[PDB]
From a paper:
Sm and Sm-like (Lsm) proteins have been found in all three kingdoms of life: bacteria, archaea and eukaryotes. They are essential parts of ribonucleoprotein (RNP) complexes and are actively involved in various steps of RNA metabolism including pre-mRNA splicing, mRNA degradation, telomere replication, histone formation and translational control. Members of this protein family are characterized by two closely spaced, conserved Sm motifs 1 and 2, which adopt a conserved Sm fold that consists of an N-terminal α helix followed by a twisted five-stranded β sheet. A common characteristic of Sm/Lsm proteins is their tendency to form a hepta- or hexameric ring structure.
Attempts of crystallization of full length SpLsm4 failed due to the poor solubility and low yield of the full length protein. The structure of SpLsm4N was also determined by the SAD method using the data obtained from a SeMet derivative crystal. The final model covers residues 12–71 of every molecule in the AU. Residues 1–11 and 72–91 are not visible in the electron density map and assumed to be disordered.
Author numbering:
A (entry chain A), B (entry chain C), C (entry chain B): 12 to 71
The structure:
């Protein structure tokens, strides 16, 4: 799966296309939908980098 | 009004063009300017979805 | 310099090309990389406005 959904420890989720990932799960997503715990969303974030340490889980 | 300004309960404002609104005031804005309570702004957010429950008021 | 790095009092940094600055250090950056204290980043923010009162320091 290039499109993945990443849930952060802070409760946010990022839904985007996987561009890079390293052995520590630091990763980059493109064309991202960011969903807040309160239900608000932001669409079409060009690119987001997420530290492996900040991730709760990832679903493909 | 297609361009509207939405002020959230968390103090942020979103200024963009109205794309959709439902009977619960869940709405979508495009080409949005987001203003933080501390004055910082982010321009040209492609699309934001805001839950009616998170809105304080809307100005047209 | 046009590319500058702005560190905010809230610990975030904004790395982008300087568009405007005023005598109070309210400024505008374009094509910006926003880095969070926890190491997550957002790339290619079209434009950000930052209030002088929110800035800790600026590096060119």
């Amino acid at each position: 799966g290039r499109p993945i959904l990443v849930e952060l420890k802070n409760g946010e989720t990022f839904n985007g296309h996987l561009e890079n990932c390293d052995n520590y799960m630091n990763l980059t997503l493109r064309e991202v939908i960011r969903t807040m715990p309160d239900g608000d969303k932001f669409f079409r974030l060009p690119e987001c980098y997420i530290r492996g340490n900040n991730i709760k889980y990832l679903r493909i």
